[PDB]
mmCIF file of C-alpha atoms in Angstrom:
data_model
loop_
_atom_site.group_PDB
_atom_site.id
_atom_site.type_symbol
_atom_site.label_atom_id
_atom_site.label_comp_id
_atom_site.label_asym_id
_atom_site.label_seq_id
_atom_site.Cartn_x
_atom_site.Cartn_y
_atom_site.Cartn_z
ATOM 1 C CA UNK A 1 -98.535 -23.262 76.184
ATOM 2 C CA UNK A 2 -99.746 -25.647 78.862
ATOM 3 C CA UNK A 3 -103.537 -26.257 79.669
ATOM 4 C CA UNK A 4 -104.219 -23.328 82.204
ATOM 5 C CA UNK A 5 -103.009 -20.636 79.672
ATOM 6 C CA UNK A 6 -104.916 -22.104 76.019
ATOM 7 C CA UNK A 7 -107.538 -19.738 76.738
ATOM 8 C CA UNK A 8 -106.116 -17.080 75.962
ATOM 9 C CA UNK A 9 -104.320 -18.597 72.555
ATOM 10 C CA UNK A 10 -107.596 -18.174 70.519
ATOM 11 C CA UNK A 11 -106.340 -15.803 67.654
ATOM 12 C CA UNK A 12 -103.307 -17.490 66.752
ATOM 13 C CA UNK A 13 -104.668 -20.908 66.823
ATOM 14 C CA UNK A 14 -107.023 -19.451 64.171
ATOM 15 C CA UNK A 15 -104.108 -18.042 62.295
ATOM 16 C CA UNK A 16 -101.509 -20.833 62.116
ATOM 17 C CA UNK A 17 -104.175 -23.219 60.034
ATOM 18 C CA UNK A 18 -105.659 -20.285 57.669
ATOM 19 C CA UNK A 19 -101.971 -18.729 57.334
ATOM 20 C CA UNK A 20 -100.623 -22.442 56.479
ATOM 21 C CA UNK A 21 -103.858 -23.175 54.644
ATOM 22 C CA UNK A 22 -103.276 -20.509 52.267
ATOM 23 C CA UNK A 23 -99.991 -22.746 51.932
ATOM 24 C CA UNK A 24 -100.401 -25.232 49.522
ATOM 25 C CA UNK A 25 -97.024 -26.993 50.547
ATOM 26 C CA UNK A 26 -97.829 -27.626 53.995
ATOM 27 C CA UNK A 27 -98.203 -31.309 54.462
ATOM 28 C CA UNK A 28 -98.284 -32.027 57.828
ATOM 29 C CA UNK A 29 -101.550 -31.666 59.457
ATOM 30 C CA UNK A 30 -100.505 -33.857 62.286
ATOM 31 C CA UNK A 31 -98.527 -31.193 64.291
ATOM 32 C CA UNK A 32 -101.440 -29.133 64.178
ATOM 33 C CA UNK A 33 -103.219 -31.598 65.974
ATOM 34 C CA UNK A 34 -100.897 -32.349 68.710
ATOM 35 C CA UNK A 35 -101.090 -28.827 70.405
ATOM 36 C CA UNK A 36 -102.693 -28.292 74.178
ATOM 37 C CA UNK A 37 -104.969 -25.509 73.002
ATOM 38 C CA UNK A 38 -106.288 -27.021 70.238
ATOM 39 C CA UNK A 39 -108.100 -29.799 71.135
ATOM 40 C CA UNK A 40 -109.489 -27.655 74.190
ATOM 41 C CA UNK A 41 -110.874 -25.403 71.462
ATOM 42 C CA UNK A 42 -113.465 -27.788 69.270
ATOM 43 C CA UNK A 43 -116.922 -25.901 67.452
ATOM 44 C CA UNK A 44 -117.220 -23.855 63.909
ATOM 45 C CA UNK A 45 -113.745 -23.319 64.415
ATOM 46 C CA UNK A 46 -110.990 -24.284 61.407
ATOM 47 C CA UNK A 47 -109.638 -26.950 63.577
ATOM 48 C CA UNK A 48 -112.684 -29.041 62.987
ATOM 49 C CA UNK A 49 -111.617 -28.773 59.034
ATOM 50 C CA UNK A 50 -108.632 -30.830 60.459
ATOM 51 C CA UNK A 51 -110.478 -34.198 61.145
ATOM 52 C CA UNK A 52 -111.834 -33.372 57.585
ATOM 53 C CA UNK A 53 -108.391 -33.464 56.463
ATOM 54 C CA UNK A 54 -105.997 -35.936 57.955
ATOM 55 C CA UNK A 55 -107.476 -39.605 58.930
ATOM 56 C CA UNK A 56 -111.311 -38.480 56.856
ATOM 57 C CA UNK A 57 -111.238 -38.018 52.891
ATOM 58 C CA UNK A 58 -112.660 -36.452 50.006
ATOM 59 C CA UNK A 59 -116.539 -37.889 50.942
ATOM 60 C CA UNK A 60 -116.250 -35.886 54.194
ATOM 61 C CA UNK A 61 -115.409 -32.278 52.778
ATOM 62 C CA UNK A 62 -117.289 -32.596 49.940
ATOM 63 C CA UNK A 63 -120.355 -33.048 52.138
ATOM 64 C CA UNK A 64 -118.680 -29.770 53.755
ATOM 65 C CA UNK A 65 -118.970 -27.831 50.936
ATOM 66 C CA UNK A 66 -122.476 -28.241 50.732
ATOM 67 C CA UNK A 67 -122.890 -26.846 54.354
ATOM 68 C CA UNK A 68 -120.894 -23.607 54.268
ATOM 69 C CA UNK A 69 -120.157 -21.741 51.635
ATOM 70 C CA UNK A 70 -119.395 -18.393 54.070
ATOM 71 C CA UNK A 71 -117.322 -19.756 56.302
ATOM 72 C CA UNK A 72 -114.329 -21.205 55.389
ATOM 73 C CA UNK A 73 -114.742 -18.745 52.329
ATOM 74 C CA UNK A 74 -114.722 -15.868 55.466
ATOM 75 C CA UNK A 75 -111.153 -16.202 56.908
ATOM 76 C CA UNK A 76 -108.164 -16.325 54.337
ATOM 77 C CA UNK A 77 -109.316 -19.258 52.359
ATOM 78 C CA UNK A 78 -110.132 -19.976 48.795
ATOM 79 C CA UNK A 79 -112.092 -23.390 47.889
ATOM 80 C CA UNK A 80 -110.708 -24.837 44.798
ATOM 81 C CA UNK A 81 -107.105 -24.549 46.291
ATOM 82 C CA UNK A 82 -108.520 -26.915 49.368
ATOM 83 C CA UNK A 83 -109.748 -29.324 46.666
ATOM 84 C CA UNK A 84 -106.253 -30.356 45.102
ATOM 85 C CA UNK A 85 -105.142 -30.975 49.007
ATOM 86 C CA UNK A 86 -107.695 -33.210 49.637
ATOM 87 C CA UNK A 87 -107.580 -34.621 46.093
ATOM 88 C CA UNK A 88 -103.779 -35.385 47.045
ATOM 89 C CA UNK A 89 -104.875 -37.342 50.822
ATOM 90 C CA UNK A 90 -107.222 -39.684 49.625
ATOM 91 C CA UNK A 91 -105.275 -40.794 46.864
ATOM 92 C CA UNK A 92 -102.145 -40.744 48.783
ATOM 93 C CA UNK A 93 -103.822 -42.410 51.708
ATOM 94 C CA UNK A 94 -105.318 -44.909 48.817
ATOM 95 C CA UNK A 95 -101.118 -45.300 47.223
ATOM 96 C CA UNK A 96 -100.314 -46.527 51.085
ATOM 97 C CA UNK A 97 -102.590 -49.568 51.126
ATOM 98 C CA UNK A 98 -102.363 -51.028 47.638
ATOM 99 C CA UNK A 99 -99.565 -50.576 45.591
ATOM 100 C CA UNK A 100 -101.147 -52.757 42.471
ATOM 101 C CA UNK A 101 -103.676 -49.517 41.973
ATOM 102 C CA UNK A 102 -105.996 -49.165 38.825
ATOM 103 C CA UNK A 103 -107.008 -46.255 36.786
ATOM 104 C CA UNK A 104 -110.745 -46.403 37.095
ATOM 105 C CA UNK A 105 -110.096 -45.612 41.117
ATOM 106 C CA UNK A 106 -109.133 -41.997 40.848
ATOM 107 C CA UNK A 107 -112.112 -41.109 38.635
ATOM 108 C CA UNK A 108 -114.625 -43.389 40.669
ATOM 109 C CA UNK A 109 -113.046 -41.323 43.555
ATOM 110 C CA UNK A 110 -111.490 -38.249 43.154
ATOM 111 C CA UNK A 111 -114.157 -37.422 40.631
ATOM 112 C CA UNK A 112 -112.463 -36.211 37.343
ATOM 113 C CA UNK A 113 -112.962 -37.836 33.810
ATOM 114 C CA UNK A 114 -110.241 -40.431 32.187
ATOM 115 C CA UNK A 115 -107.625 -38.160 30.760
ATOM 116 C CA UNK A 116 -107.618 -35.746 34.116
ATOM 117 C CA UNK A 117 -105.094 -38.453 35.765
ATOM 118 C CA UNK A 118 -101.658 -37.628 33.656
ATOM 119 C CA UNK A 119 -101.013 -34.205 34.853
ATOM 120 C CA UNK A 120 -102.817 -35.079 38.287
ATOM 121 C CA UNK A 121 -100.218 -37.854 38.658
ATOM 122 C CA UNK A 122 -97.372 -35.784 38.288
ATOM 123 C CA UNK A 123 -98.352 -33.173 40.909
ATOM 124 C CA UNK A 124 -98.665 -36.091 42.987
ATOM 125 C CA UNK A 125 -94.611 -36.939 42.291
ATOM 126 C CA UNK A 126 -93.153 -33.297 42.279
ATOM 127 C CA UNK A 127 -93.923 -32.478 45.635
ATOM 128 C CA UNK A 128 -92.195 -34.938 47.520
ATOM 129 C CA UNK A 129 -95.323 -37.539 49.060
ATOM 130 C CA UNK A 130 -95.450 -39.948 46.853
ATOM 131 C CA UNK A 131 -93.224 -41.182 44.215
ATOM 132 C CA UNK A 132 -95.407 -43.082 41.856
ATOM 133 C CA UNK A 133 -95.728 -44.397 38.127
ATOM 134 C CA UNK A 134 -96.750 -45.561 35.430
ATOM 135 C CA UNK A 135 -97.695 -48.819 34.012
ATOM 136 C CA UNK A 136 -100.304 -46.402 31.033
ATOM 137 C CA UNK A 137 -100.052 -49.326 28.574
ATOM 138 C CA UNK A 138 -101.380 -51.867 30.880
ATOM 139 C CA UNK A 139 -103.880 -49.393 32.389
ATOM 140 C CA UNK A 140 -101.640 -49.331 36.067
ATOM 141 C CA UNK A 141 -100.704 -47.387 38.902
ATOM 142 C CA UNK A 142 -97.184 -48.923 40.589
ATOM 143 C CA UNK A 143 -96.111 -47.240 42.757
ATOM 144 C CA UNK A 144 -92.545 -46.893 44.673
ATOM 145 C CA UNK A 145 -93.368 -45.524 48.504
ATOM 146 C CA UNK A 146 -96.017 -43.434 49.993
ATOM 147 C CA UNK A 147 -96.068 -41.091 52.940
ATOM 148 C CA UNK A 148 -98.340 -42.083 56.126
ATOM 149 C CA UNK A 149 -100.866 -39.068 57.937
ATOM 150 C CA UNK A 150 -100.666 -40.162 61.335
ATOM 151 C CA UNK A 151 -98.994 -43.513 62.810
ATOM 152 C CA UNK A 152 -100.376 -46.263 65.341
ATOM 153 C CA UNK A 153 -98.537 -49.072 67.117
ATOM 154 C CA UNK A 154 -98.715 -51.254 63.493
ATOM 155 C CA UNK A 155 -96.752 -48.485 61.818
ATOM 156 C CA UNK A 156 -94.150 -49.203 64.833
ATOM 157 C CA UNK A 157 -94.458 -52.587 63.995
ATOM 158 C CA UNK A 158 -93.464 -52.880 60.592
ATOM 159 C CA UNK A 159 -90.629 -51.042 61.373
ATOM 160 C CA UNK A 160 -89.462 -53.075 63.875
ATOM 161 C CA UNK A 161 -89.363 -56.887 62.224
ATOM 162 C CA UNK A 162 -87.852 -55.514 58.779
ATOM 163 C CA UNK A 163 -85.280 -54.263 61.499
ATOM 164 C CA UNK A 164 -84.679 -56.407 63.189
ATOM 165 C CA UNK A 165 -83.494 -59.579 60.488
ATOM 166 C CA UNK A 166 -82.451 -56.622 58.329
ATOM 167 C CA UNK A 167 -80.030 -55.880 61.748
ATOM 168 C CA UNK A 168 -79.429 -59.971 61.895
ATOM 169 C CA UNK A 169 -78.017 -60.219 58.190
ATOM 170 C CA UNK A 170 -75.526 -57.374 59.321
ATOM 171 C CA UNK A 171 -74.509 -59.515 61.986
ATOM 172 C CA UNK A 172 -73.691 -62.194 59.591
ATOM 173 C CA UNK A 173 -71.658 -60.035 57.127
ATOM 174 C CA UNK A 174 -70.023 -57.930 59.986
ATOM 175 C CA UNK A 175 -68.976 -61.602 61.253
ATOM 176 C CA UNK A 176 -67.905 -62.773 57.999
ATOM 177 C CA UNK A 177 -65.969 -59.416 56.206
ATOM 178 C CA UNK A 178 -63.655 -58.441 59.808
ATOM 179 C CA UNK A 179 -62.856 -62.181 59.539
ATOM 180 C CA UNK A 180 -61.045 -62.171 56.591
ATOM 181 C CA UNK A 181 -58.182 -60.101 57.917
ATOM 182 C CA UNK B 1 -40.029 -57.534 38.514
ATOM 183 C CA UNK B 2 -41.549 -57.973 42.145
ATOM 184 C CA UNK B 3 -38.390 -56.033 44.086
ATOM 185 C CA UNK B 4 -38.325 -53.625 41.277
ATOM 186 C CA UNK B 5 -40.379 -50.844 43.364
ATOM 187 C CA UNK B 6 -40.297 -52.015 47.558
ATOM 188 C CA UNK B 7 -43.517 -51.000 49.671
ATOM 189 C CA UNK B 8 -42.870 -49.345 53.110
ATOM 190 C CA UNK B 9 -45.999 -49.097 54.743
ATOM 191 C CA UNK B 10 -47.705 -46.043 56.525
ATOM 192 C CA UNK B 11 -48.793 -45.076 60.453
ATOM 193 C CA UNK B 12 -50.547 -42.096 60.911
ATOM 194 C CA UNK B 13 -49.361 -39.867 63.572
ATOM 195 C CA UNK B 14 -50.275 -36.446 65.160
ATOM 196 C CA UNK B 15 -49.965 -34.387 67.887
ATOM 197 C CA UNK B 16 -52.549 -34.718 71.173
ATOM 198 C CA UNK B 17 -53.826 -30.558 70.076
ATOM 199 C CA UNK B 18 -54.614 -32.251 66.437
ATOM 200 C CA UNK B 19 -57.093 -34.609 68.543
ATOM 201 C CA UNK B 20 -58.285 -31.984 70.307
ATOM 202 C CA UNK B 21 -59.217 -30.183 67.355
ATOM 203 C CA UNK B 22 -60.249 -33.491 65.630
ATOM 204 C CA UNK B 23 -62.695 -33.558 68.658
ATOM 205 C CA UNK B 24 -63.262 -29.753 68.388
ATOM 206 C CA UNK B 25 -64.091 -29.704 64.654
ATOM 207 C CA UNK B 26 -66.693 -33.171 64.842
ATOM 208 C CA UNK B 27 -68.799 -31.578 66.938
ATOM 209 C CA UNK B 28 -69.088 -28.238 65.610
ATOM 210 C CA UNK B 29 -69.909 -28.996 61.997
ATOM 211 C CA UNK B 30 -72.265 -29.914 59.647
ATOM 212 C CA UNK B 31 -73.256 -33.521 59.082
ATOM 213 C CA UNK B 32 -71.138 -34.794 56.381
ATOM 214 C CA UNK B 33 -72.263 -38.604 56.185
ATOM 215 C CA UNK B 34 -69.783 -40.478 55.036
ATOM 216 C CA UNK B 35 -71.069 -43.067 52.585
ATOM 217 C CA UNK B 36 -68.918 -42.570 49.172
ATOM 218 C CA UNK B 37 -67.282 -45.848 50.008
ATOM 219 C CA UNK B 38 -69.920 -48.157 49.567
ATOM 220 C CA UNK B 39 -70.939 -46.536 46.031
ATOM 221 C CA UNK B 40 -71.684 -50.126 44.255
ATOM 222 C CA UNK B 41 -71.485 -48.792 40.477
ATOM 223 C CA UNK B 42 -68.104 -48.275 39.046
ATOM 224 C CA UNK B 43 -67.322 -49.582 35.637
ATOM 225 C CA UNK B 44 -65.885 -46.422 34.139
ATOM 226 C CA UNK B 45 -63.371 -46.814 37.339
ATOM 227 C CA UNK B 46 -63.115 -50.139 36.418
ATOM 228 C CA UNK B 47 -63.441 -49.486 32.621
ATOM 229 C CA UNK B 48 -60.552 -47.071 31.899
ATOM 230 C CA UNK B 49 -58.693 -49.217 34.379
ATOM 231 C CA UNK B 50 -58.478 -52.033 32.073
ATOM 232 C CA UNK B 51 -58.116 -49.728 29.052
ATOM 233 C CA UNK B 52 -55.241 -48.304 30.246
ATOM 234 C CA UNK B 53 -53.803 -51.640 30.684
ATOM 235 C CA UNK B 54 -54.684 -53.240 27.301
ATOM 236 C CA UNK B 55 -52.512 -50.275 25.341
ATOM 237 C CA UNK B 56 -49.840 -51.150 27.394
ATOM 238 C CA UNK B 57 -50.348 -54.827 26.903
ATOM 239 C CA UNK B 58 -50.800 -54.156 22.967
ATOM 240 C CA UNK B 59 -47.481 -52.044 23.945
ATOM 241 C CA UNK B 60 -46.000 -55.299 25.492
ATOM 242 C CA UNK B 61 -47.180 -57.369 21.929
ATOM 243 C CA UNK B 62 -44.671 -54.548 20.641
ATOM 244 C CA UNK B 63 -42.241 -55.499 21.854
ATOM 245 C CA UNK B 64 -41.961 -59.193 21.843
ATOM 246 C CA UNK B 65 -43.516 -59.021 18.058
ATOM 247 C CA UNK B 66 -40.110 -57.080 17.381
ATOM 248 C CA UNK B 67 -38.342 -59.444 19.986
ATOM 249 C CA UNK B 68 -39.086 -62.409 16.914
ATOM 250 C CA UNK B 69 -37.909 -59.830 14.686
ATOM 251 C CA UNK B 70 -34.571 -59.480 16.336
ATOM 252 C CA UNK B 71 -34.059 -63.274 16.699
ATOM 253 C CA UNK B 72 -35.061 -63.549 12.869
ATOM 254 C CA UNK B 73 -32.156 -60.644 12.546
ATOM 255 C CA UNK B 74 -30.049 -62.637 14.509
ATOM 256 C CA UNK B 75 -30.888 -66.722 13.365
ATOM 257 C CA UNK B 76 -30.231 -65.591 9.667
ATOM 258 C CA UNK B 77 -26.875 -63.640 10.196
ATOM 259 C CA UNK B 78 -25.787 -66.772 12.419
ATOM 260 C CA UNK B 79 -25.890 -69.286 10.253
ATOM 261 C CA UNK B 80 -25.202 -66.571 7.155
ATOM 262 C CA UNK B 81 -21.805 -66.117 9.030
ATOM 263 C CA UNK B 82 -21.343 -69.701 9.498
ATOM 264 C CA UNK B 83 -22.065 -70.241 6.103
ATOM 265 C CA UNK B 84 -19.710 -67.523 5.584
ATOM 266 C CA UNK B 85 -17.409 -69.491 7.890
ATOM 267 C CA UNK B 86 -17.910 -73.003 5.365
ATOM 268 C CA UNK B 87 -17.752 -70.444 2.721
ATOM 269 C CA UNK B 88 -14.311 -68.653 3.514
ATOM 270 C CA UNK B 89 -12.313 -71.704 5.182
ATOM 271 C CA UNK B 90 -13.377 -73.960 2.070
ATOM 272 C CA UNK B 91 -11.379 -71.294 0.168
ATOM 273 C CA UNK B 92 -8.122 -70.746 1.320
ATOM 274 C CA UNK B 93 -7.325 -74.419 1.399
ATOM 275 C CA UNK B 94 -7.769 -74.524 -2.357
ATOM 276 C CA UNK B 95 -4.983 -71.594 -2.533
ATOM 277 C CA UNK B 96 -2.346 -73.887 -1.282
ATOM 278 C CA UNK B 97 -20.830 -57.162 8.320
ATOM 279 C CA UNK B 98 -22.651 -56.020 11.732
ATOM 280 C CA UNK B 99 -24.708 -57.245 14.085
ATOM 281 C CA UNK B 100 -27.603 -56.074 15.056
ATOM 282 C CA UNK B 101 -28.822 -54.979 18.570
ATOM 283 C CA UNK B 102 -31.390 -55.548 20.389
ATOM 284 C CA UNK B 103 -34.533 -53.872 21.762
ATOM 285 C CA UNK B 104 -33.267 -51.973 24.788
ATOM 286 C CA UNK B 105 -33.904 -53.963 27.734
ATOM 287 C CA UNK B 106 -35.244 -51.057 30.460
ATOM 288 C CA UNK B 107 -38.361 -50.787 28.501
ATOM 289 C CA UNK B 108 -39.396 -54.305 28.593
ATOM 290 C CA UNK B 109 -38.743 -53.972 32.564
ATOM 291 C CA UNK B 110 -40.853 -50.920 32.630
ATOM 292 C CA UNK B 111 -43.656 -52.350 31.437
ATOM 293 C CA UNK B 112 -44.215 -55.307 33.314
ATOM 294 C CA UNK B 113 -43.864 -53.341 36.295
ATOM 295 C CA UNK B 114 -46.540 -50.745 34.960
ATOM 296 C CA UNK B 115 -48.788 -53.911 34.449
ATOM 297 C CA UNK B 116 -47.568 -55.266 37.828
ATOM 298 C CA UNK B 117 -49.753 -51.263 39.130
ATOM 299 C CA UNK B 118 -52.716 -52.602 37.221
ATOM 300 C CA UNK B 119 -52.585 -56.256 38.472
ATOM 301 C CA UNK B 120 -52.355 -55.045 42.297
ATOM 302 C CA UNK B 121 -55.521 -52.304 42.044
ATOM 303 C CA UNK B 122 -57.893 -53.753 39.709
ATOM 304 C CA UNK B 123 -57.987 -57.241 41.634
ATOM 305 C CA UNK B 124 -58.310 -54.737 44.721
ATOM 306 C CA UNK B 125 -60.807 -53.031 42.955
ATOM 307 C CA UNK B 126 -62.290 -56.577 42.207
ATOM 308 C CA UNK B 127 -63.605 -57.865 45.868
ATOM 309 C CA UNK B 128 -63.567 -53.886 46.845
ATOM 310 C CA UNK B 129 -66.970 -54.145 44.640
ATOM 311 C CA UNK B 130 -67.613 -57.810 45.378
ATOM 312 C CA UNK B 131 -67.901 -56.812 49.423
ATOM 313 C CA UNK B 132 -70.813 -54.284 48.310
ATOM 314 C CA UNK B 133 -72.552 -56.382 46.276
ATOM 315 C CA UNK B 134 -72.475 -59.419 48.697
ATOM 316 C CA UNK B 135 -73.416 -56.651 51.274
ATOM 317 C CA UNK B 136 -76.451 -55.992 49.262
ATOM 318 C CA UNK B 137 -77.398 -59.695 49.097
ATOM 319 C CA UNK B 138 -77.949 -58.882 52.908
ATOM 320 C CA UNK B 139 -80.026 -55.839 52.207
ATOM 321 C CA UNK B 140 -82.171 -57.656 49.487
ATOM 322 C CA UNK B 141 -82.485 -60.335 51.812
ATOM 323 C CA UNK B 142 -85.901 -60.042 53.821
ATOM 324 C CA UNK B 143 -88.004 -58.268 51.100
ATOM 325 C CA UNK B 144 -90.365 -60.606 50.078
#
C-alpha cells in the first residue's frame, strides 16, 4: 500500500494483529508497526494494543485490563493468553539491560509468588528469545543473550566498535597465518 | 625409510563447461556455509590417532625385544662354537649345530614407515588445531 490507498485497508489491518494475536509464537511486533496504513489508522483500534506491547510493559496493559473488558475480549482474543506475552517482554526487555538479574525482580514485577519462576524460566528458553539460566543456589539469573524490540542508533553502535577491532585482530592473523607459506 | 614411499604432488584440472557449471551450480543452490574446517575440538581425531600409533610402537618394542633375543641366540652359539673351536682343535693334537635366523627384515621396514604416516599427519594435525585456537585468541580478544 502507499498513503493514498490505506483507507481502504481497514479490515485487514484489523485482521493481521487479532489473526497473529491468537498466535502465541509471533514475536515481532515491530513489522506491524512499520506499515503506511497503520499509523494513519490510530483510536480504539488493536493497533493502539501495540504501543502497549513493544517499547511499554506489563504496568501499561495491566492498567488496560481494568478499562475494557469487551473489547479486546470482542475480536478473536482471549486475555490470559495476552498475559504470558507480555509476561515474556518485560522480563525479556529487563534480561537486555542487566545480565547479573535477581529472583525477587520477576515476582516484584511480573507478579507471581517465589516458586512460579522455574517453569516460567523455561518458557522463556524454549522459544528462541532468550537463552537464560540458572545460578538457583546462589538465588541468580545469568543470563547468555537477549533479543532487542525495536533498535536506535546505540544498537548500531555497539555493533559497530565490537566490529570494528574484532575486524582489526583479523587483520593481524590474516597478516600473520598467509605469511607463513 | 624417507624414499621408501615418493610424493608426487597434485594440480587440479577441468574443462572450461566444468566452470561453467561450477558457476551454474553456486548460484542456483542452497546456502551450504562452509565452516567444518575451523571445528576447534578434535581429540577423538587426535585420540585414536595416537592410539593407533602406540600398538604399532608396542609392535615396534616387538620386535627389537626379540631383536636382543636373536643376538642372545647368536652371542651364545658364537662363542659356544668357538669354544667348540678350543674344544675340538685341543683334541686332535693329543691324537698324534644350526644357526639361527633372524627376524625377517621387511617387517621392521614396514613399520617405521607406518609410523613415518603418523609422524607426518598428527604434527599436521598439531598447528592444523593450533591455527584455530590462536584464531580464537583473536575472537576472545575485545570482550571485556
Amino acid at each position: 500500500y502507499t498513503e493514498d490507498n490505506a483507507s481502504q485497508a481497514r479490515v485487514d489491518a484489523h485482521r493481521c494483529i487479532v489473526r497473529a494475536l491468537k498466535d502465541p509464537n509471533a514475536f515481532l511486533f515491530d513489522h506491524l508497526l512499520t506499515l503506511k496504513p497503520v499509523k494513519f489508522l490510530e483510536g480504539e483500534l488493536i493497533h493502539d494494543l501495540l504501543t502497549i506491547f513493544v517499547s511499554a510493559k506489563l504496568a501499561s496493559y495491566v492498567k488496560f485490563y481494568q478499562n475494557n473488558k469487551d473489547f479486546i475480549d470482542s475480536l478473536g482474543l482471549l486475555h490470559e493468553q495476552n498475559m504470558a506475552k507480555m509476561r515474556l517482554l518485560t522480563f525479556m526487555g529487563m534480561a537486555v539491560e542487566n545480565k547479573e538479574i535477581s529472583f525477587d525482580t520477576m515476582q516484584q514485577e511480573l507478579q507471581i509468588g517465589a516458586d512460579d519462576v522455574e517453569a516460567f524460566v523455561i518458557d522463556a528458553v524454549r522459544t528462541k528469545m532468550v537463552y537464560c539460566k540458572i545460578d538457583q543456589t546462589q538465588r541468580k539469573v545469568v543470563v547468555s543473550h537477549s533479543t532487542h524490540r525495536t533498535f536506535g542508533k546505540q544498537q548500531w553502535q555497539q555493533l559497530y566498535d565490537t566490529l570494528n577491532a574484532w575486524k582489526q585482530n583479523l587483520n593481524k592473523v590474516k597478516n600473520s597465518l598467509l605469511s607463513l607459506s | 625409510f624417507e624414499y621408501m614411499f615418493e610424493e608426487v604432488p597434485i594440480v587440479i584440472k577441468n574443462s572450461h563447461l566444468i566452470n561453467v557449471l561450477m558457476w551454474e551450480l553456486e548460484k542456483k543452490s542452497a546456502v551450504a556455509d562452509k565452516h567444518e574446517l575451523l571445528s576447534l575440538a578434535s581429540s577423538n581425531h587426535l585420540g585414536k590417532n595416537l592410539q593407533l600409533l602406540m600398538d604399532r610402537v608396542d609392535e615396534m618394542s616387538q620386535d627389537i625385544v626379540k631383536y636382543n633375543t636373536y643376538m642372545r641366540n647368536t652371542s651364545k652359539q658364537q662363542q659356544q662354537k668357538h669354544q667348540y673351536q678350543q674344544r675340538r682343535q685341543q683334541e686332535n693334537m693329543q691324537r698324534q649345530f644350526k644357526p639361527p635366523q633372524p627376524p625377517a627384515r621387511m617387517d621392521s621396514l614396514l613399520i617405521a614407515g607406518q609410523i613415518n604416516t603418523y609422524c607426518q599427519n598428527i604434527k599436521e594435525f598439531t598447528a592444523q588445531n593450533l591455527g584455530k585456537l590462536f584464531m580464537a585468541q583473536a575472537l576472545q580478544e575485545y570482550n571485556n
